[PDB]
Design a protein around this motif. Structure first.
Motif, PDB file in Angstrom:
ATOM      1  N   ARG A  87      -4.114  -9.984  -3.146  1.00  0.00           N
ATOM      2  CA  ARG A  87      -5.018  -9.110  -2.427  1.00  0.00           C
ATOM      3  C   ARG A  87      -5.149  -7.807  -3.186  1.00  0.00           C
ATOM      4  N   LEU A  91      -8.439  -5.695  -5.104  1.00  0.00           N
ATOM      5  CA  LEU A  91      -8.844  -4.305  -4.903  1.00  0.00           C
ATOM      6  C   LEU A  91      -9.087  -3.653  -6.258  1.00  0.00           C
ATOM      7  N   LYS A 131      -6.172   4.162  -2.610  1.00  0.00           N
ATOM      8  CA  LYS A 131      -6.820   2.957  -2.125  1.00  0.00           C
ATOM      9  C   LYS A 131      -5.758   1.915  -1.764  1.00  0.00           C
ATOM     10  N   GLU A 134      -3.455   2.731   1.093  1.00  0.00           N
ATOM     11  CA  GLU A 134      -4.214   2.650   2.340  1.00  0.00           C
ATOM     12  C   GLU A 134      -4.450   1.229   2.836  1.00  0.00           C
ATOM     13  N   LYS A 135      -4.892   0.355   1.946  1.00  0.00           N
ATOM     14  CA  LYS A 135      -5.183  -1.017   2.316  1.00  0.00           C
ATOM     15  C   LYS A 135      -3.980  -1.929   2.467  1.00  0.00           C
ATOM     16  N   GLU A 136      -2.921  -1.665   1.707  1.00  0.00           N
ATOM     17  CA  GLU A 136      -1.746  -2.528   1.744  1.00  0.00           C
ATOM     18  C   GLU A 136      -0.419  -1.834   1.999  1.00  0.00           C
TER      19      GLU A 136
END
Length: 341
Positions: A87, A91, A131, A134-136
């Motif tokens: 994942r 990104l 980024k 934040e996402k992971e």
DNA sequence: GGGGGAAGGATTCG
DNA sequence: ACGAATCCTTCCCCC
């Protein structure tokens, strides 16, 4: 050219922290329990809280507990880590077409046709870190420089949760003062060979005779170091494809009995096939790690793909060839598939 | 002498 | 200091 290297800090342990956030701030130790006896095995990865006290990858689990008896010891959950890693790699693709996925926790991005100067790069870096965090919820270190090698070296110097640029000027200095053993791709074995050759810094490689350097560490490694020393290394960022897949398993007890080994060998074959997924191999190798930790292997390449039934029978013939060409007991047994159609 | 590959030990890294 | 994958040297066939 400008390369940005991303390295996910103490990855396996961080993922465990993301899956159980109450672990934050505690010493977390991800281990591979070999199951030969209580706590047999080794540490695979540990976070900073554990590393600062000397508990790191490779230290026997037993030894680790004497140092940090109250740290949290967890079994390795490789598939979860791989899915999380994928994942994150996705990104990263948003930032560059040319991306090289070096390993489960490393990737290089060629952001030349995407940024000018090392100010925009540093910013693109912060952009990538925030980024991902934040996402992971994962922390990463970013290294920036003119090539893959120095991008990696910069990250090594900024870890953990850091970012660092190594400009053309620092490069030239590093070529003079960096321990040759700190250059990626140069492991323990090569490091000692170079020292005995009189090389302790990159710049020194230019003071030796190439056919002598090449004689010791080989042509490929020789040109690699020379290129780096002359500030001419410029390998392109490109993700390679998996050339092989396999699994090796440690047996509860050492032995040289065919019927006692087969179960482990078959278990390894079954797992390797699951991982192969839709890839059909034309080559099979059986690998045996003997009692004195020496590795022996024997393989065979076929003019066609290998079915699982063919793998089972062929692996026994290879294991027999191994038991025949060596009297040492075996400790780990496994297989590797390659030459996919 | 050297091209095409198979084979297995050697080496890197967590 | 106790699992995975590629690298490097050697050997064999054959023009």
């Amino acid at each position: 050219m400008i390369v940005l290297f991303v390295d996910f800090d103490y990855f396996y342990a961080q993922v465990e922290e993301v899956l159980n956030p109450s672990l934050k701030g505690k010493p977390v130790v991800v281990c591979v329990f070999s199951g030969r006896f209580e706590d047999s095995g080794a540490v695979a990865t540990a976070n900073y809280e554990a590393r600062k006290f000397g508990v790191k990858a490779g230290i026997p689990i037993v030894e680790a507990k004497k140092i940090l008896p109250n740290a949290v010891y967890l079994p390795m959950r490789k598939e979860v880590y791989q899915q999380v890693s994928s994942r994150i790699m996705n990104l990263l693709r948003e930032y560059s077409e040319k991306i090289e996925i070096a390993s489960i926790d490393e990737a290089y991005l060629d952001i030349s046709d995407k940024v000018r100067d090392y100010r925009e790069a540093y910013n693109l870096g912060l952009e990538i870190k925030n980024k991902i965090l934040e996402k992971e919820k994962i922390t990463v270190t970013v290294g920036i420089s003119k090539n893959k090698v120095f991008a990696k070296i910069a990250a090594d110097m900024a870890k953990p949760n850091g970012i660092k640029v190594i400009d053309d000027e620092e490069v030239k200095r590093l070529i003079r003062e960096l321990d040759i053993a700190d250059v990626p791709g140069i492991g323990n074995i090569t490091a000692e060979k170079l020292k005995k050759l009189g090389i302790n810094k990159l710049v020194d490689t230019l003071s030796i005779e190439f056919d002598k350097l090449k004689g010791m560490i080989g042509e490929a490694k020789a040109k690699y170091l020379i290129s780096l020393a002359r500030d001419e290394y410029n390998e392109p960022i490109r993700t390679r494809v998996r050339k092989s897949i396999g699994r090796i398993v440690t047996m509860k007890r050492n032995s040289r009995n065919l019927e006692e080994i087969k179960p482990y060998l078959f278990r390894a074959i079954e797992e390797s096939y699951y991982k192969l997924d839709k890839r059909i191999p034309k080559a099979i190798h059986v690998v045996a790690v003997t009692e004195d930790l020496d590795i022996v292997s024997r393989g065979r390449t076929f003019p066609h793909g290998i079915s699982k039934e063919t793998a089972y029978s062929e692996s026994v013939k290879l294991l027999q060839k191994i038991l025949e060409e060596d009297e040492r007991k075996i400790r780990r047994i496994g297989v590797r598939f390659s030459k996919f159609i």
